[PDB]
């Protein structure tokens, strides 16, 4: 006769993940580059977002 | 080219008011500091009263507290010292100077005074 017994599927073996390029960044260099710093006491305080 | 035109200045009878005017070349006056500084023959430099860069502090001698008045509108690049109720002692050769900058971050207590224009005399005669 005939019968149902197994069960049968492919598996995958690497794995790819995508993102929608690094247009825009955060602009770091003017604290590093910064062409004069800030006192002791106060301070600039800049606001990343 | 830097420079400060001042107008406005001569001849008050005491007691009556007088507005100064001055422009400015080479910069934009909004970024820095300004100084009065009024300069009399066979006497010291006298210091009146500045503006600050942005405006949000203005400080006066104690001679001229609350009765000379210094205004701005930065959108023309005009200074206006008011002069109310001349007294004797006012009678000297008025400059005006600039100063330091946002440009340079630095402390309080500003330092000013690498530039001045040709400034003009009032003269409180009777």
């Known amino acids: 006769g005939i019968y149902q017994t197994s069960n049968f599927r492919v598996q995958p073996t690497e794995s790819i993940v995508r993102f929608p390029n690094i247009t825009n960044l955060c602009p770091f260099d003017e604290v590093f580059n910064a062409t004069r710093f800030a006192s002791v006491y106060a301070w600039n305080r800049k606001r990343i977002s | 080219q830097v420079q400060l035109v001042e107008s406005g200045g001569g001849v008050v009878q005491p007691g009556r008011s007088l507005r100064l005017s001055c422009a400015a070349s080479?910069?934009?006056?909004?970024?820095?500091?300004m100084h009065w500084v009024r300069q009399a023959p066979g006497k010291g430099l006298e210091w009146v009263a500045v503006?600050?860069?942005?405006?949000?502090?203005?400080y006066y001698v104690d001679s001229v507290k609350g009765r000379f008045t210094i205004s701005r509108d930065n959108s023309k690049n005009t200074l206006y010292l008011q002069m109310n109720s001349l007294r004797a002692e006012d009678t000297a050769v008025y400059y005006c100077?600039?100063?330091?900058?946002?440009?340079?971050?630095?402390?309080?207590?500003?330092?000013?005074?690498?530039?001045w224009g040709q400034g003009t005399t009032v003269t409180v005669s009777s």
């Open positions: 503006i600050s860069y942005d405006g949000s502090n203005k």
């Open positions: 100077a600039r100063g330091w900058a946002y440009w340079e971050l630095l402390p309080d207590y500003y330092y000013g005074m690498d530039v």
């Open positions: 080479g910069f934009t006056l909004s970024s820095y500091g």
